[PDB]
Amino acid sequence: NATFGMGDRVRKKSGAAWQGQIVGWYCTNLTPEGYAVESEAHPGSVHIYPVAALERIN
Amino acid sequence: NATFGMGDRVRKKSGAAWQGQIVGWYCTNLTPEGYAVESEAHPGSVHIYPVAALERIN
Amino acid sequence: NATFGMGDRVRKKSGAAWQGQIVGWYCTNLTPEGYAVESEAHPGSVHIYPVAALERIN
Amino acid sequence: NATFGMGDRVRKKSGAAWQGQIVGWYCTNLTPEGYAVESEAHPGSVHIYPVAALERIN
Ligand code: NA
Ligand code: NA
């Protein structure tokens, strides 16, 4: 039931910015659906965010 | 061919410390096999590391 | 007018946990008063947070 | 004796990329001279690095 798949382009909706491709997944009690996103601006740098923080873009 | 699975207890081998359970996975060109690890000391806090940075513990 | 000083013991108030000593400072438009905190559980690992996310403890 | 000052434009020398302005400082035993850098590509997002990881650019 994953919202995003590998390679989707996503951005953070608000606050500190982040944008790039989905490169992984994680799950905790605090964040039952989380994603790893590699920056499209800073190759190799990856952030993890809850699904609710992210939106898919073209 | 994953080295670790969900729930394995791992620690960072050197440098800044980190220890807890595997909670996810990611893959980039820089890090073709990476893991998300939730701290066992700081619930909810998650770091991502390359496989080579981590070792499984009891 | 800094809320915390070097060496203060602080914790994150909510969400993902973090606890340890103040080891630095930063300032952005999003976070005009921010602090670096070295984990007391994971030596060497440092997170940065806005002041509003942190509280001083004994 | 700080290598960089607030507002210097810096980049990470190798590995995962990062580039933007110095916005803060930190010091630990592992990293006796560290800096906070706000991405110029992703406003509001800040990483911390040891001085040896960074170089000043125009
Ligand atoms: Na991380
Ligand atoms: Na950082």
Numbering used by the authors:
A (entry chain A), B (entry chain A), C (entry chain A), D (entry chain A): 21 to 78
Direct quotes from the study:
Plasmid-encoded bacterial R67 dihydrofolate reductase (DHFR) catalyzes the same reaction as the chromosomal counterpart but is highly resistant to the widely used antibiotic Trimethoprim (TMP) unlike the chromosomal enzyme. Dihydrofolate reductase (DHFR) catalyzes the reduction of dihydrofolate (DHF) to tetrahydrofolate (THF) employing nicotinamide adenine dinucleotide phosphate (NADPH) as a cofactor.
The structure of Q67H mutant of R67 DHFR complexed with a non-specific inhibitor Congo red (CGR) has been determined at 1.15 Å resolution. R67 DHFR-CGR binary complex crystals belong to the space group I4122 as in previously determined structures. In the Fo-Fc map, one of the two naphthalene moieties in CGR is clearly observed, however, the biphenyl linker and the other naphthalene moiety are not seen owing to flexibility. CGR does not utilize its twofold axis to align with any of the three crystallographic twofold axes of the tetrameric protein instead, it binds like the asymmetrical folate and NADP+ at any one of the four symmetry-related positions in the active site pore. Amino acid residues Val66, His67, and Ile68, with their symmetry-related partners form the immediate vicinity of the bound sulphonated naphthalene. So, we conclude that CGR can bind in any of the four symmetry-related positions, however, only one CGR is bound at any given time due to stereochemical reasons leading to a stoichiometry of one CGR per tetramer. In striking contrast to bisbenzimidazole inhibitors, Congo red does not use its symmetry for binding and the sulphonate does not interact with Lys32 or YTT cluster. In our work, CGR is bound asymmetrically between two anti-parallel β strands in the active site pore with no changes in the protein structure.
